[PDB]
């Protein structure tokens, strides 16, 4: 047996952050020896565990969130942080116990002119509870004037695109974040 981590980490195209495709891992053995000091793993924030002793902690379930965000938005993928990525877009629990993994993906997502297939939830007047998403879009956000239609200037369209460019920073580059969450999954 083996896990499908390389079906999760070494995948072709990831989710966006508004529609983070949660992938559940179970009935498996979880080898983390190829996963801690592999070369493109810039971020390996683990919270409830230690990654050296991740090979001998049996869990009954493993979730694997996965999306694509900016470099300087990995600061919100952490318990108890506020932005519009943890608040409005993807909330991580205060009782988090998994790991937050990320790596630069300027070659695979950002292109020379601009790649706009990645979207985030800028506007929402209710904070997200931990571990759920809203995928549906509608222009009616509660600014004022409840009239509905394809317009703006008081109520704006929620989803907006990242502007990804290669000569635009490394804190503004697509970081393919994979968030793990935690007795049939041993090491």
């Amino acid at each position, epitope marked *: 047996n083996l896990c499908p981590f390389d079906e999760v980490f070494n995948a072709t195209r990831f989710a966006s952050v508004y529609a983070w495709n949660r992938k559940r891992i179970s009935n498996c053995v979880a080898d983390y020896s190829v996963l801690y000091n592999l070369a493109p793993f810039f971020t390996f*924030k683990c919270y409830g565990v230690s990654p050296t002793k991740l090979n001998d902690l049996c869990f009954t379930n493993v979730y694997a969130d996965s999306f694509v965000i900016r470099g300087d938005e*990995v600061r919100q993928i952490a318990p108890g942080q506020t932005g519009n990525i943890a608040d409005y877009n993807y909330k991580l629990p205060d009782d988090f116990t998994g790991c937050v993994i990320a790596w630069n993906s300027n070659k695979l997502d950002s292109k020379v002119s601009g790649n706009y297939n990645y979207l985030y939830r800028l506007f929402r007047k209710s904070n997200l509870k931990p571990f759920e998403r809203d995928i549906s879009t509608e222009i009616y956000q509660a600014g004022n004037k409840p009239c509905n239609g394809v317009a703006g200037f008081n109520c704006y369209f929620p989803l907006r695109s990242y502007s990804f460019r290669p000569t635009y*920073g490394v*804190g503004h580059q697509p970081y393919r974040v994979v968030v793990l969450s935690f007795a049939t999954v041993c090491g």
Partner: antibody
Amino acid sequence: QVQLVQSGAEVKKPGSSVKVSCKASGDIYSTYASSWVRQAPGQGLEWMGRIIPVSGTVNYADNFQGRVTITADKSTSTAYMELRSLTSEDTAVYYCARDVARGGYSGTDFFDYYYGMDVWGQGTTVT
Amino acid sequence: SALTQPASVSGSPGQSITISCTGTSSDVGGYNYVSWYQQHPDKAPKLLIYDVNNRPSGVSTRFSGSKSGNTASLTISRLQTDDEADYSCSSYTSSNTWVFGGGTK
């Protein structure tokens, strides 16, 4: 609290190569990361690079890409600095400091160093 | 690179001064992460502010910073007689770098 101890000065007139070692063995967690700055005589600081010794992930300022190679070993958790192709204008002071990770978690975060630099070395006045 | 900042300061005790650090809208203004350092003559610097306004523990009351959308600013009130040093800035700089802008002395 972390007790950075740095190397000695050098009188390397140009064309030489300089290594400066930043020995720190105090509150060495997995979140420890030692940045590197220049200070020229008479003007202000210039941040050079950054190392996370538990991973070896290296930042640079683009004025020091290919000039500096910040080497660090995981077990001793201390950092070196190989400035190469020197100039007489490179006579400066080269502190090492400690970037503060903002969070309680495991090792290897490339991004959390945005608090500041609290503790510093003692300066190697490399000429 | 090289956030401009004036190196001019009046050493008259009993008044209040203000030093404004400017910068582009990815260095300071793109972030709320401007920090400040003071430096001894020919020693290492030490930390005063970290985020915009804050302070670590061993920091006096008058050491306060502020932003203005694009031009960050520290101020000093009740200028103590022998406290003049080399004030230096920093910021998260959109590429994980810091950027120290000059000094003031």
